[PDB]
């Protein structure tokens, strides 16, 4: 088990760190990029994972970037209404030839870090 | 024909020693960033 | 800019940047699709689940493997793994970086040509290269001469390397995978009274095999001790909360590696395959080959495999010969590490397949550019 | 030795069959159920009967709850199995168990404790001089009379495919599927709800089984038959309940057995029986496959649906390469075939060497069964 212990230590040290500084850098960079465009409608985000759960912030970001006007989000605070808002945002992204896989409403709502970061990166890279 | 004619195995050994030294030190360093994201900062 | 190293064996995918010690992303190579009808209006719409996100919701998916025995059976799925690797995990632009890919020794040429065509046409990579895994294992090990046996989920292969040269004579490719061991483990767990049929239950059986297995030094005393007493018994908790006891089978599933007669195959064991690959080489180089045996791959992570391999090779080898078995504690990722080293050499930058060279030569450039 | 004939007992999940060696047909065939009363008992002087087993458990099923001792080929309750064996030996055949040896059949892939407990029960209580345990699908090939072939046995508990070439069986190509007529009866009971008929008790399950055995068939083309059933009413048939009520099964007749070929109707992820047979064929070596293509043998009571052979042949032909010739061998006596094979195995002069003696059991405990048999 000593060999397995050394291997497990390698897993929980090296790969953890080599990911972890990368997403904590990219989170700040993406937050700055989104907040710069979102200043025109006078809306700020202070944490990337919490603010994208409602789906209205992503709708406003696509509102600023796209140039035309998206459908209304549902005026409700339930989980299913958040799923509606995120699904509407993903539908609008799908209509503009943007390729997304392993992307769903429940993934954004539940707060998966790497999938939210991948969605933001795809919007940055392909839409602008 | 695959390997270049003039090369050093000691170069490969020194290179893997340089990588393993950084593994031992465990210095934190982020990955490369795109130039498009370099523009926004 | 630093290149990308993408190790793609069957079952798991590893990805990272060049010049780094460890890969950034490690995730299984599974693509699942929902089989049950959805009745709740307003949920998320997902046609396919890729990678680790697929393995969380195993209860409503039919798991499938795009790579079988080192061969990509489904290319549309392989595109999904590659795209999820590039955009969701690494979140890097594919056209900004060159990429490095790994494969088994003996494969059809159509696999190499299709990887080159997909890697150039779809992702618009500026450069790419295809490297053999087992040679990269020796770069990770740190010796210019030795024989390496890479056994992973999908494939097992032995190659000897002398002075950085890969001898095509003694390359042996055995189709004794860890997935075959998982299927044998299911078949022998049927005897105790436990039945696993679905692919999610196959993943549970794989977790059982990884957590609770070992290789005995001698099989007969282990069987006699298992029959005599109940000291060699362990318990495992299923995801539904049911406790199962394995007992005898813990040293029976990996023993199929050394004796393939349990699985019904005709090929010899891994020790005999390594010995035969050693015998195929020249007489005067057998010294370094016997003294520098290297183990690699996730299949060789069972406890006690190194001592058993040393004993089995020593029995076959001449008595005057020194036998040494090298097993690094981090050998499972060693292949990727070798690739990173090969990606960071100054003289390797001359070896990249440029985009315009591919435009001139077609997909057949890969055969003349890389080994 | 000459006049003494070993008893042959076929023991499936649904029904139990028993007879003497050297006979073409079993003497006693009866369902394997054990029923117990549930209501009040108010008439004094009628006598006390704690348990009902066998055919006369079926006759008084109105006031009984019915339990199956064998589920999916596994003996869950052993006391009821002892009841069934005692009723077989004494009431049905009227033979002393000490006089003759006993031959038993079982599924290929079963837990070890089932075999050990079978050996322990047949030596310790019934006191038999010898006993042997064999596989049902192997005995089906004995009944067929050919050296080579692939046997697909489908009973009430389990379906299994074994290939045999030149008297040699391949253990790695043996396939087991937990999809039998038991689940088909449950599926028919589920799909009869949408026409307004409700069967819930264990007594009504026998009525549903009778409806399945009388008014079911396998369509050669599923979609065309569904279109025909939607277009016209010529496919409808009428059945009479024991209380005189009349029901019309209609569309369901070809939908209940269709779950054999498409298990997704039951929520199962497994493949169909045709795909299971094809996969069992391709798990063997290259050379024998042609012979395994030419001698596919059907067996068991589940394969008694009309039109099963044509659909199976069509599906296998679609899966197999076109240059091979595919035929399906289904004798009219395929419900009893296993038992016939047992008798053929029990009367051989060579097989007298292979009996498990009582002295060997006394020396080796119940673990002797794995070393012998198969
Ligand atoms: N800790 C462990 N102990 C024993 N076996 C393991 C362990 N981890 C993984 N394996 C086996 O190794 C296989 C993974 O091999 P891997 O090195 O990922 O192959 P590749 O990288 O070529 O895809 C798994 O299928 C599993 O059966
Ligand atoms: N004539 C028939 N037509 C269609 N199906 C039948 C017929 N007779 C029996 N069956 C099915 O077969 C089952 C009985 O199978 P059986 O031969 O008793 O299996 P085993 O003997 O292996 O237990 C019944 O439950 C029923 O579903």
PDB file of N, CA, C and O and ligand atoms in Angstrom, chain D residues 10-17 68 136 153-158 180-182 184-185 209 212-214 216 300-306 334-336, ligand 2:
ATOM      1  N   UNK D  10     -36.184 -33.394 -14.092  1.00  0.00           N
ATOM      2  CA  UNK D  10     -35.946 -32.071 -14.650  1.00  0.00           C
ATOM      3  C   UNK D  10     -36.609 -31.045 -13.741  1.00  0.00           C
ATOM      4  O   UNK D  10     -37.814 -31.131 -13.468  1.00  0.00           O
ATOM      5  N   UNK D  11     -35.824 -30.070 -13.287  1.00  0.00           N
ATOM      6  CA  UNK D  11     -36.238 -29.134 -12.243  1.00  0.00           C
ATOM      7  C   UNK D  11     -36.000 -27.711 -12.731  1.00  0.00           C
ATOM      8  O   UNK D  11     -34.955 -27.117 -12.454  1.00  0.00           O
ATOM      9  N   UNK D  12     -36.975 -27.162 -13.451  1.00  0.00           N
ATOM     10  CA  UNK D  12     -36.926 -25.778 -13.860  1.00  0.00           C
ATOM     11  C   UNK D  12     -37.624 -24.871 -12.866  1.00  0.00           C
ATOM     12  O   UNK D  12     -38.079 -25.290 -11.803  1.00  0.00           O
ATOM     13  N   UNK D  13     -37.706 -23.592 -13.232  1.00  0.00           N
ATOM     14  CA  UNK D  13     -38.370 -22.628 -12.362  1.00  0.00           C
ATOM     15  C   UNK D  13     -39.884 -22.762 -12.437  1.00  0.00           C
ATOM     16  O   UNK D  13     -40.580 -22.573 -11.432  1.00  0.00           O
ATOM     17  N   UNK D  14     -40.414 -23.084 -13.613  1.00  0.00           N
ATOM     18  CA  UNK D  14     -41.850 -23.151 -13.794  1.00  0.00           C
ATOM     19  C   UNK D  14     -42.487 -24.459 -13.380  1.00  0.00           C
ATOM     20  O   UNK D  14     -43.355 -24.478 -12.503  1.00  0.00           O
ATOM     21  N   UNK D  15     -42.071 -25.560 -13.999  1.00  0.00           N
ATOM     22  CA  UNK D  15     -42.697 -26.854 -13.779  1.00  0.00           C
ATOM     23  C   UNK D  15     -41.628 -27.911 -13.546  1.00  0.00           C
ATOM     24  O   UNK D  15     -40.498 -27.799 -14.026  1.00  0.00           O
ATOM     25  N   UNK D  16     -42.001 -28.945 -12.796  1.00  0.00           N
ATOM     26  CA  UNK D  16     -41.115 -30.048 -12.460  1.00  0.00           C
ATOM     27  C   UNK D  16     -41.573 -31.300 -13.191  1.00  0.00           C
ATOM     28  O   UNK D  16     -42.776 -31.597 -13.241  1.00  0.00           O
ATOM     29  N   UNK D  17     -40.612 -32.028 -13.757  1.00  0.00           N
ATOM     30  CA  UNK D  17     -40.873 -33.233 -14.527  1.00  0.00           C
ATOM     31  C   UNK D  17     -40.023 -34.367 -13.973  1.00  0.00           C
ATOM     32  O   UNK D  17     -38.883 -34.149 -13.564  1.00  0.00           O
ATOM     33  N   UNK D  68     -43.479 -19.345  -5.398  1.00  0.00           N
ATOM     34  CA  UNK D  68     -42.560 -20.103  -6.229  1.00  0.00           C
ATOM     35  C   UNK D  68     -41.249 -20.289  -5.485  1.00  0.00           C
ATOM     36  O   UNK D  68     -40.585 -19.293  -5.163  1.00  0.00           O
ATOM     37  N   UNK D 136     -28.856 -28.303 -18.485  1.00  0.00           N
ATOM     38  CA  UNK D 136     -30.030 -28.574 -19.311  1.00  0.00           C
ATOM     39  C   UNK D 136     -29.715 -28.449 -20.797  1.00  0.00           C
ATOM     40  O   UNK D 136     -30.146 -29.286 -21.605  1.00  0.00           O
ATOM     41  N   UNK D 153     -31.600 -22.377 -24.742  1.00  0.00           N
ATOM     42  CA  UNK D 153     -32.644 -22.908 -23.878  1.00  0.00           C
ATOM     43  C   UNK D 153     -33.320 -21.751 -23.161  1.00  0.00           C
ATOM     44  O   UNK D 153     -32.651 -20.957 -22.489  1.00  0.00           O
ATOM     45  N   UNK D 154     -34.640 -21.661 -23.300  1.00  0.00           N
ATOM     46  CA  UNK D 154     -35.435 -20.609 -22.682  1.00  0.00           C
ATOM     47  C   UNK D 154     -36.575 -21.253 -21.910  1.00  0.00           C
ATOM     48  O   UNK D 154     -37.499 -21.810 -22.511  1.00  0.00           O
ATOM     49  N   UNK D 155     -36.509 -21.179 -20.586  1.00  0.00           N
ATOM     50  CA  UNK D 155     -37.541 -21.754 -19.749  1.00  0.00           C
ATOM     51  C   UNK D 155     -38.395 -20.699 -19.082  1.00  0.00           C
ATOM     52  O   UNK D 155     -38.653 -19.642 -19.662  1.00  0.00           O
ATOM     53  N   UNK D 156     -38.850 -20.979 -17.862  1.00  0.00           N
ATOM     54  CA  UNK D 156     -39.608 -19.998 -17.099  1.00  0.00           C
ATOM     55  C   UNK D 156     -38.713 -19.104 -16.255  1.00  0.00           C
ATOM     56  O   UNK D 156     -39.143 -18.019 -15.854  1.00  0.00           O
ATOM     57  N   UNK D 157     -37.483 -19.521 -15.984  1.00  0.00           N
ATOM     58  CA  UNK D 157     -36.632 -18.755 -15.099  1.00  0.00           C
ATOM     59  C   UNK D 157     -35.537 -17.962 -15.779  1.00  0.00           C
ATOM     60  O   UNK D 157     -35.283 -16.815 -15.404  1.00  0.00           O
ATOM     61  N   UNK D 158     -34.884 -18.550 -16.781  1.00  0.00           N
ATOM     62  CA  UNK D 158     -33.681 -17.960 -17.354  1.00  0.00           C
ATOM     63  C   UNK D 158     -33.512 -18.497 -18.770  1.00  0.00           C
ATOM     64  O   UNK D 158     -33.995 -19.580 -19.102  1.00  0.00           O
ATOM     65  N   UNK D 180     -37.176 -14.461 -19.378  1.00  0.00           N
ATOM     66  CA  UNK D 180     -37.918 -15.690 -19.617  1.00  0.00           C
ATOM     67  C   UNK D 180     -39.417 -15.392 -19.637  1.00  0.00           C
ATOM     68  O   UNK D 180     -39.843 -14.236 -19.615  1.00  0.00           O
ATOM     69  N   UNK D 181     -40.220 -16.458 -19.672  1.00  0.00           N
ATOM     70  CA  UNK D 181     -41.669 -16.330 -19.706  1.00  0.00           C
ATOM     71  C   UNK D 181     -42.286 -15.774 -18.439  1.00  0.00           C
ATOM     72  O   UNK D 181     -43.446 -15.354 -18.469  1.00  0.00           O
ATOM     73  N   UNK D 182     -41.541 -15.778 -17.335  1.00  0.00           N
ATOM     74  CA  UNK D 182     -41.991 -15.148 -16.097  1.00  0.00           C
ATOM     75  C   UNK D 182     -42.151 -13.641 -16.284  1.00  0.00           C
ATOM     76  O   UNK D 182     -43.210 -13.063 -15.990  1.00  0.00           O
ATOM     77  N   UNK D 184     -42.319 -12.195 -19.175  1.00  0.00           N
ATOM     78  CA  UNK D 184     -43.319 -12.013 -20.223  1.00  0.00           C
ATOM     79  C   UNK D 184     -44.730 -12.046 -19.651  1.00  0.00           C
ATOM     80  O   UNK D 184     -45.599 -11.285 -20.088  1.00  0.00           O
ATOM     81  N   UNK D 185     -44.977 -12.927 -18.678  1.00  0.00           N
ATOM     82  CA  UNK D 185     -46.267 -12.945 -17.995  1.00  0.00           C
ATOM     83  C   UNK D 185     -46.505 -11.642 -17.246  1.00  0.00           C
ATOM     84  O   UNK D 185     -47.612 -11.088 -17.286  1.00  0.00           O
ATOM     85  N   UNK D 209     -51.166 -16.380 -17.377  1.00  0.00           N
ATOM     86  CA  UNK D 209     -50.280 -17.349 -18.017  1.00  0.00           C
ATOM     87  C   UNK D 209     -51.039 -18.235 -18.997  1.00  0.00           C
ATOM     88  O   UNK D 209     -50.530 -18.554 -20.078  1.00  0.00           O
ATOM     89  N   UNK D 212     -51.702 -16.227 -22.075  1.00  0.00           N
ATOM     90  CA  UNK D 212     -50.478 -16.165 -22.867  1.00  0.00           C
ATOM     91  C   UNK D 212     -50.242 -17.459 -23.636  1.00  0.00           C
ATOM     92  O   UNK D 212     -49.865 -17.437 -24.812  1.00  0.00           O
ATOM     93  N   UNK D 213     -50.460 -18.603 -22.986  1.00  0.00           N
ATOM     94  CA  UNK D 213     -50.231 -19.875 -23.659  1.00  0.00           C
ATOM     95  C   UNK D 213     -51.275 -20.172 -24.726  1.00  0.00           C
ATOM     96  O   UNK D 213     -51.017 -20.995 -25.610  1.00  0.00           O
ATOM     97  N   UNK D 214     -52.441 -19.528 -24.675  1.00  0.00           N
ATOM     98  CA  UNK D 214     -53.471 -19.847 -25.656  1.00  0.00           C
ATOM     99  C   UNK D 214     -53.534 -18.861 -26.820  1.00  0.00           C
ATOM    100  O   UNK D 214     -53.801 -19.270 -27.954  1.00  0.00           O
ATOM    101  N   UNK D 216     -51.204 -16.196 -28.002  1.00  0.00           N
ATOM    102  CA  UNK D 216     -50.026 -15.391 -28.292  1.00  0.00           C
ATOM    103  C   UNK D 216     -49.269 -15.982 -29.471  1.00  0.00           C
ATOM    104  O   UNK D 216     -49.270 -17.196 -29.684  1.00  0.00           O
ATOM    105  N   UNK D 300     -36.883 -25.606 -24.514  1.00  0.00           N
ATOM    106  CA  UNK D 300     -37.607 -24.950 -23.449  1.00  0.00           C
ATOM    107  C   UNK D 300     -39.028 -24.588 -23.851  1.00  0.00           C
ATOM    108  O   UNK D 300     -39.378 -24.511 -25.031  1.00  0.00           O
ATOM    109  N   UNK D 301     -39.860 -24.355 -22.836  1.00  0.00           N
ATOM    110  CA  UNK D 301     -41.267 -24.093 -23.090  1.00  0.00           C
ATOM    111  C   UNK D 301     -41.534 -22.689 -23.600  1.00  0.00           C
ATOM    112  O   UNK D 301     -42.586 -22.426 -24.189  1.00  0.00           O
ATOM    113  N   UNK D 302     -40.596 -21.767 -23.373  1.00  0.00           N
ATOM    114  CA  UNK D 302     -40.794 -20.390 -23.818  1.00  0.00           C
ATOM    115  C   UNK D 302     -40.729 -20.282 -25.336  1.00  0.00           C
ATOM    116  O   UNK D 302     -41.344 -19.386 -25.925  1.00  0.00           O
ATOM    117  N   UNK D 303     -40.026 -21.203 -25.991  1.00  0.00           N
ATOM    118  CA  UNK D 303     -39.903 -21.199 -27.442  1.00  0.00           C
ATOM    119  C   UNK D 303     -41.042 -21.933 -28.139  1.00  0.00           C
ATOM    120  O   UNK D 303     -40.867 -22.380 -29.278  1.00  0.00           O
ATOM    121  N   UNK D 304     -42.198 -22.071 -27.490  1.00  0.00           N
ATOM    122  CA  UNK D 304     -43.359 -22.727 -28.073  1.00  0.00           C
ATOM    123  C   UNK D 304     -44.322 -21.751 -28.738  1.00  0.00           C
ATOM    124  O   UNK D 304     -45.400 -22.168 -29.169  1.00  0.00           O
ATOM    125  N   UNK D 305     -43.971 -20.472 -28.811  1.00  0.00           N
ATOM    126  CA  UNK D 305     -44.827 -19.514 -29.495  1.00  0.00           C
ATOM    127  C   UNK D 305     -44.865 -19.833 -30.988  1.00  0.00           C
ATOM    128  O   UNK D 305     -43.855 -20.262 -31.555  1.00  0.00           O
ATOM    129  N   UNK D 306     -46.009 -19.664 -31.646  1.00  0.00           N
ATOM    130  CA  UNK D 306     -46.053 -19.869 -33.098  1.00  0.00           C
ATOM    131  C   UNK D 306     -45.273 -18.788 -33.829  1.00  0.00           C
ATOM    132  O   UNK D 306     -45.389 -17.599 -33.527  1.00  0.00           O
ATOM    133  N   UNK D 334     -40.017 -29.896 -28.061  1.00  0.00           N
ATOM    134  CA  UNK D 334     -38.892 -29.165 -27.491  1.00  0.00           C
ATOM    135  C   UNK D 334     -39.147 -28.707 -26.065  1.00  0.00           C
ATOM    136  O   UNK D 334     -38.229 -28.178 -25.430  1.00  0.00           O
ATOM    137  N   UNK D 335     -40.361 -28.893 -25.547  1.00  0.00           N
ATOM    138  CA  UNK D 335     -40.621 -28.577 -24.148  1.00  0.00           C
ATOM    139  C   UNK D 335     -40.010 -29.617 -23.217  1.00  0.00           C
ATOM    140  O   UNK D 335     -39.547 -29.274 -22.123  1.00  0.00           O
ATOM    141  N   UNK D 336     -39.989 -30.883 -23.632  1.00  0.00           N
ATOM    142  CA  UNK D 336     -39.537 -31.985 -22.793  1.00  0.00           C
ATOM    143  C   UNK D 336     -38.136 -32.463 -23.158  1.00  0.00           C
ATOM    144  O   UNK D 336     -37.636 -33.415 -22.542  1.00  0.00           O
TER     145      UNK D 336
HETATM  146  N1  LIG E   2     -47.684 -23.694 -25.327  1.00  0.00           N
HETATM  147  C1  LIG E   2     -46.956 -22.622 -24.932  1.00  0.00           C
HETATM  148  N2  LIG E   2     -46.842 -21.527 -25.712  1.00  0.00           N
HETATM  149  C2  LIG E   2     -46.121 -20.460 -25.327  1.00  0.00           C
HETATM  150  N3  LIG E   2     -45.460 -20.383 -24.159  1.00  0.00           N
HETATM  151  C3  LIG E   2     -45.490 -21.410 -23.281  1.00  0.00           C
HETATM  152  C4  LIG E   2     -46.256 -22.614 -23.629  1.00  0.00           C
HETATM  153  N4  LIG E   2     -46.121 -23.469 -22.602  1.00  0.00           N
HETATM  154  C5  LIG E   2     -45.336 -22.867 -21.676  1.00  0.00           C
HETATM  155  N5  LIG E   2     -44.958 -21.642 -22.079  1.00  0.00           N
HETATM  156  C6  LIG E   2     -44.098 -20.716 -21.308  1.00  0.00           C
HETATM  157  O1  LIG E   2     -43.037 -21.466 -20.722  1.00  0.00           O
HETATM  158  C7  LIG E   2     -43.084 -21.388 -19.298  1.00  0.00           C
HETATM  159  C8  LIG E   2     -42.839 -22.773 -18.728  1.00  0.00           C
HETATM  160  O2  LIG E   2     -41.552 -23.178 -19.177  1.00  0.00           O
HETATM  161  P1  LIG E   2     -40.910 -24.562 -18.683  1.00  0.00           P
HETATM  162  O3  LIG E   2     -40.664 -25.447 -19.878  1.00  0.00           O
HETATM  163  O4  LIG E   2     -41.721 -25.043 -17.507  1.00  0.00           O
HETATM  164  O5  LIG E   2     -39.502 -24.027 -18.128  1.00  0.00           O
HETATM  165  P2  LIG E   2     -38.647 -24.896 -17.086  1.00  0.00           P
HETATM  166  O6  LIG E   2     -39.171 -26.300 -17.260  1.00  0.00           O
HETATM  167  O7  LIG E   2     -37.221 -24.719 -17.545  1.00  0.00           O
HETATM  168  O8  LIG E   2     -38.992 -24.249 -15.769  1.00  0.00           O
HETATM  169  C9  LIG E   2     -44.447 -20.839 -18.928  1.00  0.00           C
HETATM  170  O9  LIG E   2     -44.338 -19.913 -17.846  1.00  0.00           O
HETATM  171  C10 LIG E   2     -44.894 -20.112 -20.169  1.00  0.00           C
HETATM  172  O10 LIG E   2     -44.490 -18.754 -20.023  1.00  0.00           O
END
